[PDB]
Structures are given as structure tokens and as C-alpha cells.
Amino acid sequence: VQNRASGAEIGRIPVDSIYSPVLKVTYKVDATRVEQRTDFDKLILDVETK
């Protein structure tokens, strides 16, 4: 945030802000495709926070 936008002295140093706790996310699906056509998926979701 620019120093002028807020009312701040010369000694203020605005800093870029990153408010994100999550670090890395991925997933993989285990699809079962049988010959009799009763199918379904299986989502395995992996979450890593800081």
C-alpha cells in the first residue's frame, strides 16, 4: 500500500502481504471400470499447509 494512500510518515515501509496458509495441494483418482458397468471414482486429496 502506497505510503501516501494512508496517513504515514517518512519512516513507514509498506510491505507486500501474502495471507495464504496453504502451501501445496495435489490429488489422484482411482477409477474402477469393471466389465459389468458398475463404476465409481475415489478422490485422494493431499493438502499441505505452512
Partner: protein, 1110 residues
């Protein structure tokens, strides 16, 4: 490798180089210390040219002295040039706008040749700018570079040109001297041998020969082997020496009465009296070598001689006769052949010392003219050597050279590599060289004599292509200005380690093999047949018994910038030229990162450029800080190194220096002790390693466009700092008393808040366009004697208070913090330009992130502007959730023939992940000749592939097959080098694997924020009332002739009429249309442009009665 603290960068090189890369700034520094005559050069010449050591200044002073009058009754002589210590250090000179220079003194001695009264004095000859330890000059505070010039050497050049009318060969010869008069001998369509002295009509050679004192018997005695010379002599029509002299006088002296003494003396004056004709030492050497006259005698004397002229004529007639070789009486025989003027045996280099010597020479010529004119208008016995010398022309010549020239330029300081490339440049254009608009295509080519001497790749891409080149890595310039290259001589089939430097002619005589040949560990080629270079650059297969020499290494034909491209031989020359030229446009970033896959040239180029701090003496670090490093030497003494923090370069970039040592470490001599702008622990680091995918993605990387992750903006990966400089000064003026103050007329207080108590803004204050940086007022002038006001001023005491605020405002499109303020003043007896009381300089700094439209690039010429910057969630990501950073298009790679980027991507992935070749039972065959300790690497390993001896395709494939898993035992990239990506925007996996890896990309200094501009209305010109030009004023875009043709072709007459009248220079139309727009009315009709009326007035001023009828 040979630096005491360099990082461990493991190389794929198979060969071993006998010779280390020379000092890369030796051209400049060894050319200047010859000019001033340092003891270092004296020793260097002693172990080489001890026959005649003399500097440039001593040569000039010896050729100048003595200065004598016509009677010869008095003389003046100069000797013993001497320098004092520099007036101030480098840093003070750069800070205070002072030229870095040293005083020069000479010993002038005046002798009266009729009284013998000798008068010696020490004469001050001015302040002589001195070169720093980095190859630069500091003139008026700025740092400059003198470029070496490629010219044509003086000598004799024979050439043949066919004839259209007769289809006959017509030979010719040109004797081009240094600073003299030309004379050409030629054979015309009729079988006769002519002459063109100075620049006149052809005359028979017999006339010149007789004028030289040759009887018609001697001519037919020696020149009796040719029908042409007999034919010319018979039809000569001139008998008697005096008649020939008179005819030459007629041709040369227009409208003057011919005589015997004048004709006898003028011919010898033009070519034999050495005051109006010089060949130098290079010209004399070249003439003697071409004609083979004086092989033994040393070169002392620089004028022509009758022997040379007769030998030239004989050579020309025998060349026309079709002879093979010719022997001249008293000299060894030589081959009779024509010359190539683009041969690097005929083009010499005028280095930084030669150019300054030439300027001192013209200055001294002017001074001696003044001296010998002043020696006749002063009475004798009042003359002292100080009253004859006028030093002003000499110092004027130096100022003219160092301020106004096409070879004295502002140092290129975009990044450290730019300056090193600037100091090793050979430009064929300058005063005394060819011109950019008048250069053909035969001088822009790459002659086969350039091998090892001028890099064929690195050259400008514009209309300067071929006219500016760069010196190769191993090349050196010999005492005559000819470039040399080391060769490893092979004696009887045994490749020795004796390095010999050969210039292009000697390299022509012998047969040279290649560096990457199969040496068998005992200096013996494996096979008898090897590629070589024969006389005219011909490449053949000679049995390995004729070979005389071999190159000291590959990478001998490339320059510094082109030696930093990995996998250069997999890229075509067109794209490698761009890749080399775009590496010196990269901007320094806030934090630097060394490439994962380099070539090993980065460390040497970083330490030789000079932007790093290097320990002068070994010792132990005592104190470290962001501002200095204190080293405690082994013997008592201590040294403190000060750092350049956030300093502006010539091109507005940051020039930080930060230490890379701690308070207890021990350092060694020559060890890098503090990084620089674009260095990472001593190695060049111009860009960053980004994870890349080589797929087309939704058309955003279409036609050379690029897609970036938003992580590179959040994490400040491609951020850079740019600094600006603003100047203003207070000057006396005839009215007097300019002042820097806060009391400015017609200005409120809200616009006087950031200013401190005495004008200048406060440090730390952010500014926008239009804000005042330095408050200043000047007298309003118009000193007027109005009765009441003047009578109040005079006796009553009313003050003038005439003020006109010429304040310093930050120009359009600029902003940022105020980081520094430098204020000079006359009160503190600072050295300021004459008539200036005060001078204040304000520095404004910005921090710029990467954004759409900014230009990026790799090292292989794969440029492109940033098309989009995607959020990190909608990007292709690996199976473990890792997004890619950059996406490059597929259609650009195979068509441009720069497949080196794909191999760099593969090796970058291998280096990032780390590998381990499994030598469980025997090393694999593909890893047989792979160097040891390359069979395994740790993650994030730095490797190097030299330019022409690096990683083979089989080795890359093998390394890809064996590469470590990341965290869990998952290998993301298979043996082909491709990965299965997920579509972060839809979610489904992409159907086919994609190529992923790590590429080293650079941020170029072509940012959008300097390129965007718009204007509704603004300032206009004065003579013609059209809008100005440029962003800093405001200015409009130009609607040229071609854009007018386009609109005429469309048929749009009203658009074209308004664009040229009520948008440019219809003075009433502008205001009327603005009013109509703001009030919602209809746009009015245009009038007459003002430029047409200006044209009419100029035509009338040329006395032409131009009138418009009705």
C-alpha cells in the same frame, strides 16, 4: 578452477586446455601504458622488442623536435615527458564531477645557433586524463570507454579489374601512406603504364622516371622485359629530365610559371621530405615485406625512396605480364600476387593509445606552427622557452577527443557483461574509417582470416551488422596493430606444448589442425586424416604428417559473451547472434541466482569485468557490515574495502555490492570478497532458473508471446530497482543572483510541504509527476525605469523583487522515493563550472515488478514479451502439485533451429533433481568417457558444458534415465524427458506427456512502463504550431507519409483532413473543437494549417513571389 574461492562447478569437458584465458582487459591497459611509457610496458617490450623501446609521447616529441627557423639561427627541442601523481582518487573524481587526470611536464631547451646560450625549462603541458585499473576514463564525472578502430594498414596494394570494352585484365597499384599524398600506377586499355600523382590526370610512367633522374637508356636497360614499358617510352614524347620536371609541375601546380629549382624541390618535398609524407613503422614494414627490400635493417625512416617506386613499377608490370615470383636487386624474391584488402593481415587495429597519440600529434603540430611563427616576431635574447610555447591548442585537442568523437563513448553499464563487451569492441566506423550509410556487403562479411581473431557471431543486428565486432578470448594485438592467436606447434607428429602467436599471414603459410582432434595421451593423433585449414581458408583432409600447428582449444573463435551460451553448436548462427546480443541487455535483479547449467566462463568474466571486490592481499576478516569489509593482513597492516550501495549506473540501474564473507573467515589474494550487481558468489548471474513447459496453452503464448506464473510476482523473482538522476544549478547571470529557496512566487503551501527549510525535498518523500524537487527563482529581468517605481527603488529603497521561478519539477511519467540528495556550493570552495554558484542533484528510485508486455529472453535467442500472468492455481502442475513457472510455445523451436534450449531444459531438470549412475556391475557404456565425480550429483547441483566440448546426447539420455525421486519415491519426468501434467483450469490431465525442465531466463531492459504514452492535448512547438514529441514533454504520435497513403487508399478523406488540420496545427480549430466536444456541439470545419503559411514565408524569404489566386 584457478580462483582461490570459486564454487565447485563440475564440467563435462573431455579435452584439456594448455593455455589459460588471458586477462580480458589487456588490450586497453597494455595499449595505454605504452602511450604513457610505464616501466611495466618497458619490461614487457624488453622480453620481446628490446631493440627500440619508445612510448607514444616520446615518439611524438622526437618527431616534433627540433623546431628551427628558415635561417637556422635558433632551435627549440622537447624531451623527457614526465607525469605527476593524479590530482585526486577515482571515487572523489566520480563524486565531485572532476576529470581523473595527471599533470604532464616536458623539458624544453632553447638554443641560439650564433651565441650558444642554452636555456632549459620545465614546461607544463596540461593535465592528461589517465586510465583507471578497469580500462575506463573518467571525464567530467562520467565513465567513458575508447573503442578500438579497425582501419586499413598503409602500404602498397595491387588489384586487377576486368575491362568491359576489351575484356582485358587491367591491373593497378595504390600507395596509401599515413598522412601523405597518394600515387597510383595503372595499365589502361591501351598498353601503357600511367601515373596519378596526388590526384591528377594520368601521365606516362616514363615522365616520372625521368623526373627522378633516369635516362632513356637506363629505363630500357632495367625495364626491358616488357612490351608495355617500351611502348610507353617510345610514345613518351618527352626528352630530357628538365622537361619531365616541367610537365609534372604543370600537372601539379595550376597557373604558375614553371621553373627548374621549384620543380626540382617540390617533387622531392611531396614524397621524400618527411615533413609532408610519412609511412609510420607499420607502413614501412609492409612495403619492405611486400617488395622484400630491407629484410635485415631495422625500421628507422618513414619516407619513400626511388628504390621503392621503381620496385613498385616493376612489380606491377611483371604482375600484368603474368609472372609468378620476382626478385629485386639487393633483396630477396617475393611472390607476385594481388591483394585482398579485407584480409586481417591488411587490416590493423588503432587501439586506445594510438588514437590519443594522433590527437596529441595534431595538437603539437598546431603548437609548433604557433612557436615558429612567434620565433620571428620577438626580438632575440628576450626569448625564453616559456614565451614560445602556447599550450592551449594541445589541451583543446584532448578535450575535443574525450568529449566529441565516435570512438569515445559513455561506458555501457546495463549490467557487468555490457561493460566488458564494450571494452573489447572493434568498430570499423569512426574518423578515418568507413561509414554506415556507405558500406557495402563485402566489408560486412566474415572473412576466413577472422578465425581466432574476431568473433563471427557477436555483432549488431541492425544496420551496423558487420561493421562492429568483438575480440576473441585468446587474441592479442602485436606492436604494429595486428591481431594474433596462440597455436600449439606439432613437431614431427608430436603435439607439443610450445605456444606460438601467429598473425594472419603466418597462419596463412602453415597448415593448422583442429583443437577437438583425437590426441592419444602422448601428443599423437589417433588417425592420419584430420580436418585442417589450408592457405585460403580451405578445409581438407591432410594425412597427419604435414600438420604444423593446432588450436590451443575450441572456444578460441568465440568472444566472451558468446562463450556463455551452453550448447552453442546445437543452435544456428542466426539465433546465437541474438542470444549473445541480448545477454548484455539483461537488467540486474534485487536478488541474483547463478545458472544450474553454465559453461565455466561466468567466473572469469565476472572477476575480469571488475564489478566485484577482490581481496588484494591474503589475511583474516576482522569486521563485516553492509558498508565495508576490514581485512587484517598477515603483517600488521589492515585494509578497509568500502562498498557501493544503491548507486546509479550510466543506464539507470542499481549497482549494489554486498559482502559474501563472515567476520572470522580467512581470505586469499585474488579471492572474491563481495558480490556485485549481477553476480552470485563471484559468477555472472543475469537471470533466474524457472520451471518450464513446452506446450501451446490456449493461444496466450501465440506468436512468440509468453505465459508467467503469478508466483514470480508474489515472491519478487524478476523484480529490479531503477534509479533516476535530476540536476539543477544556480548561476550568476548578468542580472545576477539566482537563488535556491522556498520563497517561490505564486505557489501555495500545500505544494511546499515536502520541501525542507532551504528548498530541496526531504529524503524519503515519495513524488509524482509535476512535484517540485528543488525550489529556485531567477531575476525576472525587464529592468525598467518607470518613474515612481525607479525613484522609490533608488532613494526610498523599494526592493526589486523581480522573480521568475525556474524550479526543478519531476518530469512526466516518473515517481518513486527520494533516496539521496547531493548539494554543492561555492561557499565550501567546491570546484564548480565557471559562473555557477550552487549545484544540487536528487536521486529518485523505483522498484519495478514483472508485468504484461515486459520482455524476457533465454540464452539461445528465444525472446518474447509476456502475454499473460496467470494465477498460480490455473497452471499446468506436476503429479505432486508443483505448478510450472513459465510456458513456451512449441511452434517456435523447430523452425528457428535453436534446439539448444531443449537440451538445456533437459540438463537443467537433471541438475535440479540430482542423479546417480548405478555402477553396480561395471559403469554403463554411455558413461565410459564421462568424467569421474559426474556419476552422481546432489539435488540443485551446478554443472558446466563448455561451448564446443560439453555434454553429448547419449550422456544426456543416460542421465535422464537415472534421476533421483523428489520426496516420496516418485519420478515425475520419464526417460524421454516429458511429464504428465494436469490442467489446473479444468482439472483433467493433459492426454499426452509434455516436456518439462529448468531454463535460465533473463529480464531485458525493454519494460512497458517506459513505453506507454497517451495525449489528448498539450504543449505545442513554436515556429510551427504542431505538438511536441517525446513522453517527457508530452508530444503526439507522428502521422507520417505512409500512414497518409494508407488513408488515401482507404478513401477516407474526412479522417485525413481532420488529422492534419484540427489535430496538428489549425490554431483556431483546436480550441473550437475542444469547446464543441465539452459543450456537446458539432465539431466545426477545419481551416488552414500554420505550416503552409510558414512555408509561404520561407519561400518569400528566398526571393520568390509566391501568391495565392482566386
Amino acid at each position: 578452477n584457478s580462483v582461490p574461492g570459486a564454487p565447485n562447478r563440475v564440467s563435462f569437458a573431455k579435452l584439456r586446455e594448455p593455455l589459460e584465458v588471458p586477462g580480458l582487459l589487456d588490450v586497453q591497459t597494455d595499449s595505454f601504458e605504452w602511450l604513457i611509457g610505464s616501466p611495466r610496458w618497458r619490461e614487457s617490450a624488453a622480453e620481446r622488442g628490446d631493440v627500440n623501446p619508445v612510448g607514444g609521447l616520446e615518439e611524438v616529441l622526437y618527431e616534433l623536435s627540433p623546431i628551427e627557423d628558415f635561417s637556422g639561427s635558433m632551435s627549440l627541442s622537447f624531451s623527457d615527458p614526465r607525469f605527476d601523481d593524479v590530482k585526486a582518487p577515482v571515487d572523489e573524481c566520480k563524486d565531485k564531477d572532476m576529470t581523473y587526470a595527471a599533470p604532464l611536464f616536458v623539458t624544453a631547451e632553447f638554443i641560439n645557433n650564433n651565441t650558444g646560450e642554452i636555456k632549459s625549462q620545465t614546461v607544463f603541458m596540461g593535465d592528461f586524463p589517465m586510465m583507471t585499473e578497469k580500462g575506463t576514463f573518467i571525464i567530467n564525472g562520467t565513465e567513458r570507454v575508447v573503442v578500438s578502430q579497425l582501419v586499413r594498414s598503409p602500404g602498397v596494394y595491387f588489384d586487377e579489374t576486368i575491362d568491359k570494352s576489351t575484356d582485358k585484365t587491367l591491373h593497378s597499384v595504390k600507395v596509401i601512406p599515413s598522412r601523405g599524398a597518394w600515387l597510383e600506377f595503372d595499365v589502361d586499355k591501351r598498353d601503357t603504364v600511367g601515373v596519378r600523382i596526388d590526384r591528377k590526370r594520368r601521365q606516362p610512367v616514363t615522365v616520372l622516371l625521368k623526373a627522378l633522374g633516369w635516362t632513356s637508356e637506363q629505363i630500357v636497360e632495367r625495364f626491358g622485359f616488357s612490351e608495355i614499358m617500351r611502348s610507353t617510352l617510345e610514345k613518351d614524347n618527352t626528352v630530357g629530365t628538365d622537361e619531365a620536371l616541367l610537365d609534372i609541375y604543370r600537372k601539379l601546380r595550376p597557373g604558375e610559371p614553371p621553373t627548374k629549382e621549384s620543380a626540382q624541390t617540390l617533387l622531392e618535398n611531396l614524397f621524400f621530405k618527411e615533413k609532408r609524407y610519412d609511412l609510420a613503422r607499420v607502413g614501412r614494414y609492409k612495403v619492405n615485406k611486400k617488395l622484400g627490400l630491407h629484410v635485415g635493417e631495422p625500421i628507422t625512416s618513414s619516407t619513400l625512396t626511388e628504390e621503392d617506386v621503381v620496385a613498385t613499377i616493376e612489380y606491377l608490370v611483371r604482375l600484368h605480364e603474368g609472372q609468378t615470383t620476382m626478385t629485386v636487386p639487393g633483396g630477396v624474391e617475393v611472390p607476385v600476387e594481388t591483394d585482398d584488402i579485407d584480409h586481417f593481415g591488411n587490416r590493423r587495429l588503432r587501439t586506445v593509445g594510438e588514437l590519443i597519440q594522433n590527437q596529441i600529434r595534431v595538437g603539437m603540430s598546431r603548437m609548433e606552427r604557433v612557436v615558429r611563427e612567434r620565433m620571428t616576431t620577438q626580438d632575440v635574447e628576450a626569448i625564453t622557452p616559456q614565451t614560445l610555447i602556447n599550450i592551449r591548442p594541445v589541451v583543446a585537442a584532448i578535450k575535443e577527443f574525450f568529449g566529441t568523437s565516435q570512438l569515445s563513448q559513455f561506458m555501457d553499464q546495463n549490467n557487468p557483461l555490457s561493460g566488458l563487451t564494450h571494452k573489447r569492441r572493434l568498430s570499423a566506423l569512426g574518423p578515418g574509417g568507413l561509414s554506415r550509410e556507405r558500406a557495402g556487403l563485402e566489408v560486412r562479411d566474415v572473412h576466413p582470416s577472422h578465425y581466432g581473431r574476431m568473433c563471427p557471431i557477436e555483432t549488431p543486428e541492425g544496420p551496423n551488422i558487420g561493421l562492429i565486432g568483438s575480440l576473441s578470448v585468446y587474441a592479442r594485438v602485436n606492436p604494429f596493430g595486428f591481431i594474433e592467436t596462440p597455436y600449439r606447434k606439432v613437431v614431427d607428429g608430436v603435439v607439443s606444448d610450445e605456444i606460438v602467436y601467429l598473425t594472419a599471414d603466418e597462419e596463412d603459410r602453415h597448415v593448422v589442425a583442429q583443437a577437438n582432434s583425437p590426441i592419444d595421451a602422448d601428443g599423437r593423433f589417433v588417425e592420419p586424416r584430420v580436418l585442417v585449414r589450408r592457405k585460403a581458408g580451405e578445409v581438407e583432409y591432410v594425412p597427419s604428417s604435414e600438420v604444423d600447428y593446432m588450436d590451443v582449444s575450441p572456444r578460441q573463435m568465440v568472444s566472451v559473451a558468446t562463450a556463455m551460451i551452453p550448447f552453442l553448436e546445437h543452435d544456428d548462427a542466426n539465433r546465437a547472434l541474438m542470444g549473445a546480443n541480448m545477454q548484455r541487455q539483461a537488467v540486474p535483479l534485487v536478488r541474483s541466482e547463478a545458472p544450474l547449467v553454465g559453461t565455466g566462463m561466468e567466473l572469469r568474466a565476472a572477476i575480469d569485468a571488475g564489478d566485484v571486490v577482490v581481496a588484494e592481499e591474503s589475511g583474516v576478516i576482522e569486521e563485516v557490515s553492509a558498508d565495508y569489509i576490514t581485512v587484517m593482513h598477515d603483517n600488521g597492516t589492515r585494509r578497509t574495502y568500502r562498498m557501493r550501495k544503491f548507486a546509479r549506473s550510466n543506464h539507470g540501474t542499481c549497482a549494489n555490492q554486498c559482502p559474501i564473507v563472515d567476520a572470522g573467515d580467512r581470505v586469499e589474494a585474488g579471492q572474491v570478497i563481495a558480490d556485485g550487481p549481477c553476480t552470485d558468489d563471484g559468477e555472472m548471474a543475469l537471470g533466474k532458473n524457472l520451471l518450464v513447459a513446452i506446450m501451446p496453452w490456449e493461444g496466450h503464448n501465440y506468436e512468440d508471446a509468453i505465459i508467467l506464473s503469478n508466483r514470480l510476482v508474489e515472491e519478487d523473482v524478476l523484480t529490479s530497482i531503477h534509479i533516476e538522476e535530476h540536476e539543477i544549478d544556480a548561476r550568476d547571470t548578468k542580472l545576477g543572483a539566482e537563488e535556491i529557496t522556498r520563497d517561490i512566487p505564486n505557489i501555495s503551501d500545500e505544494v511546499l510541504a515536502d520541501l525542507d527549510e532551504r528548498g530541496i525535498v526531504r529524503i524519503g518523500a515519495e513524488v509524482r509527476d509535476g512535484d517540485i524537487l528543488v525550489g529556485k527563482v531567477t531575476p525576472k529581468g525587464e529592468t525598467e525605469l518607470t518613474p515612481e517605481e525607479r525613484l522609490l527603488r533608488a532613494i526610498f529603497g523599494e526592493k526589486a523583487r523581480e522573480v521568475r521561478d525556474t524550479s526543478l519539477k519531476v518530469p512526466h511519467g516518473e515517481s518513486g522515493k527520494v533516496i539521496g540528495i547531493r548539494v554543492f556550493s561555492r561557499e565550501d570552495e567546491d570546484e564548480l563550472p565557471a559562473g555557477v554558484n550552487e549545484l544540487v542533484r536528487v536521486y529518485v528510485a523505483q522498484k519495478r515488478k514483472i508485468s504484461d508486455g515486459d520482455k524476457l529472453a533465454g540464452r539461445h535467442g528465444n525472446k518474447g514479451v509476456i502475454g499473460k500472468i496467470l494465477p498460480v492455481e490455473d497452471m499446468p502442475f506436476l503429479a505432486d502439485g508443483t505448478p510450472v513457472d513459465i510456458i513456451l510455445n512449441t511452434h517456435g523451436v523447430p523452425r528457428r533451429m535453436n534446439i539448444g534450449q531443449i537440451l538445456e531444459t533437459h540438463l537443467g531438470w537433471c541438475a535440479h533433481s540430482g542423479w546417480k549412475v548405478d555402477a553396480a556391475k561395471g559403469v554403463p557404456d554411455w558413461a565410459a568417457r564421462l568424467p569421474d565425480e559426474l556419476l552422481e550429483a546432489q539435488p540443485n547441483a551446478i554443472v558446466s558444458t563448455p561451448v564446443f566440448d560439453g555434454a553429448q546426447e547419449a550422456e544426456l539420455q543416460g542421465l535422464l534415465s537415472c534421476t533421483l525421486p523428489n520426496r516420496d519415491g516418485d519420478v515425475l519426468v520419464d526417460a524421454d524427458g516429458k511429464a504428465m501434467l494436469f490442467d489446473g483450469r479444468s482439472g483433467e490431465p493433459f492426454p499426452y506427456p509434455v516436456t518439462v525442465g529448468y531454463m535460465y531466463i533473463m529480464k531485458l531492459h525493454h519494460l512497458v512502463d517506459d513505453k506507454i504514452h497517451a495525449r489528448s492535448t498539450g504543449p505545442y512547438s513554436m515556429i510551427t504550431q504542431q505538438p511536441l514529441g517525446g513522453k517527457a514533454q508530452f508530444g503526439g504520435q507522428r502521422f507520417g507519409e505512409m500512414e497518409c497513403w494508407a488513408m488515401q487508399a482507404y478513401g477516407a478523406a474526412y479522417t485525413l483532413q481532420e488529422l492534419l488540420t484540427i489535430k496538428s496545427d489549425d490554431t483556431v480549430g483546436r480550441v473550437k473543437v475542444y469547446e464543441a466536444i465539452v459543450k456537446g456541439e458539432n465539431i466545426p470545419e477545419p481551416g488552414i494549417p500554420e505550416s503552409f503559411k510558414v512555408l509561404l514565408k520561407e519561400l518569400q524569404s528566398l526571393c520568390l513571389n509566391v501568391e495565392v489566386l482566386s
